[PDB]
RNA sequence: CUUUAAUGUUUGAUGUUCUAACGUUGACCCGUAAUCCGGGUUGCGGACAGUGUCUGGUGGGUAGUUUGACUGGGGCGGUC
RNA sequence: AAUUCCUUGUCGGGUAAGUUCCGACCUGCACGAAUGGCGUAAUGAUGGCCAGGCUGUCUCCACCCGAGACUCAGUGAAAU
RNA sequence: GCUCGCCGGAAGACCAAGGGUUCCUGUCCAACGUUAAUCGGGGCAGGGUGAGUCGACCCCUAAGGCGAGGCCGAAAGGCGUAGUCGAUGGGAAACAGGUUAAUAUUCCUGUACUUGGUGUUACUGCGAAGGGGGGACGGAGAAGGCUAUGUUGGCCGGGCGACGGUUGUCCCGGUUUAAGCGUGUAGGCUGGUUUUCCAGGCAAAUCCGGAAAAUCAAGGCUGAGGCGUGAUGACGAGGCACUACGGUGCUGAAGCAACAAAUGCCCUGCUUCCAGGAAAAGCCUCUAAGCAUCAGGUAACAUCAAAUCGUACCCCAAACCGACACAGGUGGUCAGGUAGAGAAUACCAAGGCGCUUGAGAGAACUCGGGUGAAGGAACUAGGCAAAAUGGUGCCGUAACUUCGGGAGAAGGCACGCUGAUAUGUAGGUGAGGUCCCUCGCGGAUGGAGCUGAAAUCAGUCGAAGAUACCAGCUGGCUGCAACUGUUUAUUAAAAACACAGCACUGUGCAAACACGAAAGUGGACGUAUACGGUGUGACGCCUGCCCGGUGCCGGAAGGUUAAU
RNA sequence: AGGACCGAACCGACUAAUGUUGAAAAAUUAGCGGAUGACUUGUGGCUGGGGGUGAAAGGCCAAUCAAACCGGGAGAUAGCU
RNA sequence: ACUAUG
RNA sequence: CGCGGGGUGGAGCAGCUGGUAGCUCGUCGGGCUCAUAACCCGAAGGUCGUCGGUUCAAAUCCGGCCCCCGCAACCA
């Protein structure tokens, strides 16, 4: 069967990457929330 | 001429196509083409605002001249072309100063025909001139509404506004709907009917032929579930509503013109 | 008092004109290398249209809810 | 009758025998004209019925070829 | 190592994506590996990825994104102009041979090409953010020309056979060579050249567009392949020798012709059809502002430059997505032989595998296959399943029909091998030689050689000649839906949805309607022969009565009635 | 010529058997339907939860759908176990 | 205002 | 059965709120016509299904019995 994850680095990084988050208000709140949690990976980048 | 194609497959059985031998075969005139990319009925929010549109064949936009604003200078019809954006065929014209433009092809107009705009022009089909300078009685097309804006009324295939009255600044038009209507009389109108009037006699003959013109399927309310449409549910085939749009407004009867600023210009609503 | 008249009078609302608010998804000019926007010139509408506050009508388009108990199981019937 | 409760209605056809099928009748419990009526060549992994061919489907199972089953060696689960 | 078996339009080779050291060498076997393991995609150490031309980067744009000013919005924000991003598309250039344990169009050997910079010399109207050209575009179909490629002959080098025959019309192996540069062919497109005038291309234009005369008909553009050169080279079956028996060294034969032939190239061609088939830059050309001894432009020669990042390995998979070393999923490219219509199927080549538990036994029962006396649907809810039918050519073919269909209806017949017609025909191809010529990649006749159906007649073997694999069961009545389609990913494929067609109704354009507190966008760069909604559902014959009820439409006299 | 016919790739999913702590959280074997189109497929893009999209099955929206998932109100409330 | 049948 | 409705001159209907039985057709008698039908005139006829209660009094209010319709008889 074809399964749901069909990986593609361009699409990963445009959905979820660092500059994607730093666009919207809401995505900056996300980065703050995980800096605050203390989180080794912020985002999905390299 | 209309042509009952012979029934060799079940989808050819009912097709009736509108062959015109007089049209151009070969690529259309290049300077007047644009890109024109499709919407699938969706707006700047991505949402379908208009159901049933989608797909079909790619199409270039022919820049037609609806204004006809180039005056006193005679023009010869080079050829009649197919135009996919449009029920009417169009005509390439060459002016006496070597400009080309497309225009709508009126009924009875072939290669070699002189056609002229502005106020001097003779009252013969093809020719555009302000409606003060046309005889009452006359049959026109591609009619403006504000002076200088360009033709809006009577552009489809086989259509014609018909001038019924002068009265000062304004004139009165029996539009094709059956709606008498004042337009102020500096507004231009080409003369004639519009061509290709056999266009209504065509029959597409199969589903796919509708898809080629960019027209998706249409699902009846009574098929759907109650959450999707007012016509909703039923065990079996019920109705028992009064017919309504998907957004719950009565169809079959209910009038929907509220537009008070344009009311003064309407002599009489359609029959 | 009844009926009625012109003297004057305060508001009325029913037309018809007008232009100066307002409209213009008419045309041209400029910012400008720009089908946005703004400004100008000129037409066409014109106190209408349209927006606010108040108000009647409509309104399963949407929402929140209700839709009793007894009962030789429940429902129907019957009762309170 | 994708509609008929009574109903395996009655009559005819087909079978040695037909609650199904086909043709009729009309007593339509409770068909019916674009929530369409009656017809229809072609089309259908569509529903029902009949016939020829073919057969281990069956009378009624028999034998054979491989893979597991069983024994030996090594590894080694699970529901409860 | 020697046999055996399996894949071979893949179970082979090569890209992209995705992974990221899994690659190669040494070493170790605790754990991992559904068993052991000296082996490993496991542990440890070391090694390996070499570019002006391949790809990204870069120049250009699509859908789309972001968006200075701007418009709109309690706030957050929303939409959008100028712009600026965004490939899956457009834009310069490389081939052959060699070599490592592991890279190679990247290294080495040869032979090339591309675009920039600076300098010299000769000649000279250069120059946009503007004008024009070009780039620049669909589907189907046909058939002519080729090549990749293959088969056969000839040429060269080996062999003369473990068992009867095998010095011959016998056997085995080889017969390969690129980009580039030169020539310009089958074919395809097109009248050509010079002058004069002109409300068009936002201004100017010598460019494009337009109108006019005058003059020769053959000039131009495009273009596969072939031949020439590249190549006196490279490769090359082997042979002559040294070897840690892994390989290292030295030399090197022939290297032609014919036929068949693509789904590849001419071909972005040609013919045809309606549903009428991106954009922008590079590129070519025109001028305006500007500058004229300059600057810049054109050609020739020199000289310098072409950075950076990717480059290992897996890729129909043990390395990707599925928790697994998982019978699943995954875009593109290549396409040998014999049979065959074929990319089906069988057997094979190149190449690659034997699927990481085995060894015996030969019970019941289960799984997957084979055969079956007599009968032949009696089975069963139901012929479910199985059996059967199956090819090519020829004969022949009913009701009904929308005249197309039904129809491959049904149902028959022939089919192997050998020979003759003809030591191989009809046909296809076409050399040598003669003849001609605006003398070449030319034309005429000419037919050697090569290839080669189909038929008839005569013979001959078998139980059976479409012998295997492959490959329709057929007919009759009837319901529903006209038809091809669509549907419940994971128990429903249907009579459900859709459909062409029909009808009603709304909508006069700042349209109705829809998404949005709004700006705005779709509708539509459409305009009533158009667009939205609702119902019915090809076609044929038709479509009756009711306006009391409920909606909708119109009507305004009177009644009742809100804020004020 | 054709939403024409037969039939590989490719798309699908009608019947049966197996499997049902599977080889597989939907497959395998044998047959089956489409196969120049209302076809199929790659890369990128748009539509967002009472919202989308829907040839309409309440289908699909990351193995979840008559209202997704993650966090919060939150120790919701539970005359019931 | 009249009308049907034998 | 559970619920509800209806039995009225010969036929179809009205009257059901206790003191009063009507409407159209049919029957009977008279006319008109040669005769019949139509047409004109005049007259009758109803135990109000049946039994029993209540009231001074019952078609009428109330109960039982009989016939006749309609609706319901469901979830497993």
What is the distance, to the nearest Å, from the Cα of residue B225 to the centroid of all Cα atoms in its chain? Answer: 36
Spatial separation of the C-alpha atoms in residues B169 and B181, rounded to whole Å: 14
Spatial separation of the C-alpha atoms in residues B212 and B14, rounded to whole Å: 17
Specify the length of chain B in residues: 271
- Maximum Cα–Cα distance for chain B, whole Å? 72
| Domain A1-46, CATH number (from 1.10.10.10, 1.10.287.3980, 3.30.70.100, 1.10.1050.10) | 1.10.287.3980
B44 CA to F56 C1' in angstroms comes to: 27
Which nucleotide lies nearest residue B211, CA to C1'?
F38
Using the CB atom, is residue B264 less than 7 Å from strand E? no
H or E element, residue A18: helix A18-23
- Measured CA to CA in angstroms, residue B246 lies from B47, B102, B106, B229, B243 at distances of 16, 41, 40, 5, 10
Token pair belonging to A6 = 């069909």
The strand pair at B114-115 and B75-81 is best described as antiparallel
Structural domain boundaries of chain A? 1-46
Residue B117 contacts residue B89 (beta carbons within 8 Å):
no
CA atoms within 13 A on the CB side of B207: 3
Chain B residues 120 to 179 whose Cβ lies within 7 Å of strand D are none
Using the CB atom, is residue B157 less than 7 Å from strand E? yes
Q: What counts of helices (H) and strands (E) characterise chain A?
A: 3, 0
H or E element, residue A31: helix A25-37
H or E element, residue A33: helix A25-37
Spatial separation of the C-alpha atoms in residues A5 and B35, rounded to whole Å: 37
Residue B258 contacts residue B233 (beta carbons within 8 Å):
no
B258 CA to E548 C1' in angstroms comes to: 34
Dihedral sign computed on CA atoms, order B73, B78, B79, B83: negative
Using the CB atom, is residue B237 less than 7 Å from strand D? yes
Using the CB atom, is residue B146 less than 7 Å from strand C? yes
Using the CB atom, is residue B260 less than 7 Å from strand C? yes
Using the CB atom, is residue B73 less than 7 Å from strand E? yes
Spatial separation of the C-alpha atoms in residues B90 and B98, rounded to whole Å: 19
Using the CB atom, is residue B10 less than 7 Å from strand D? yes
Spatial separation of the C-alpha atoms in residues B134 and B205, rounded to whole Å: 42
Which nucleotide lies nearest residue B149, CA to C1'?
C26
Specify the length of chain A in residues: 46
Residue A44 contacts residue A17 (beta carbons within 8 Å):
yes
Token pair belonging to B207 = 């589903």
User: How many CB atoms neighbour CB B229 within 10 A?
Assistant: 20
H or E element, residue B139: strand B139-141
């Amino acid at each position: 069967m074809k399964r749901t994850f069909q990986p593609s680095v361009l699409k990963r990084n445009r959905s979820h990457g660092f500059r994607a988050r730093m666009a919207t208000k809401n995505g900056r709140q996300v980065l703050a929330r995980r800096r605050a949690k203390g989180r080794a990976r912020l985002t999905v980048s390299k | 001429a209309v042509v009952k194609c012979k029934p060799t497959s079940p989808g050819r059985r009912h097709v009736v196509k509108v062959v015109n031998p007089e049209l151009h075969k070969g690529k259309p005139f290049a300077p007047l083409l644009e890109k024109n990319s499709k919407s699938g009925g969706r707006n700047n929010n991505g949402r379908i605002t208009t159901r049933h549109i989608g797909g079909g064949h790619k199409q270039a936009y022919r820049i037609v001249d609806f204004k006809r604003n180039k005056d006193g200078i005679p023009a010869v019809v080079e050829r009649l072309e197919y135009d996919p954006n449009r029920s009417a065929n169009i005509a390439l014209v060459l002016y006496k100063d070597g400009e080309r433009r497309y225009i709508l092809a009126p009924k009875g107009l072939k290669a070699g025909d002189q056609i002229q705009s502005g106020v001097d022009a003779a009252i013969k089909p093809g020719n555009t001139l302000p409606m003060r300078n046309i005889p009452v009685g006359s049959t026109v097309h591609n009619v403006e509404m504000k002076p200088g804006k360009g033709g809006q009324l009577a552009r489809s295939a086989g259509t014609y506004v018909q001038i019924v009255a002068r009265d000062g600044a304004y004139v009165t038009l029996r539009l094709r709907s059956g709606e008498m209507r004042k337009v102020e009389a500096d507004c231009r109108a080409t003369l004639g009917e519009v061509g290709n009037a056999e266009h209504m006699l065509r029959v597409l003959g199969k589903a796919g032929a509708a898809r080629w013109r960019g027209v998706r399927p249409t699902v009846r309310g009574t098929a759907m579930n109650p959450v999707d449409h007012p016509h909703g549910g039923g065990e079996g085939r019920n109705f028992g509503k009064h017919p309504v749009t998907p957004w719950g407004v009565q169809t079959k009867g209910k009038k929907t013109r509220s537009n008070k600023r344009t009311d003064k210009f309407i002599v009489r609503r359609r029959s």
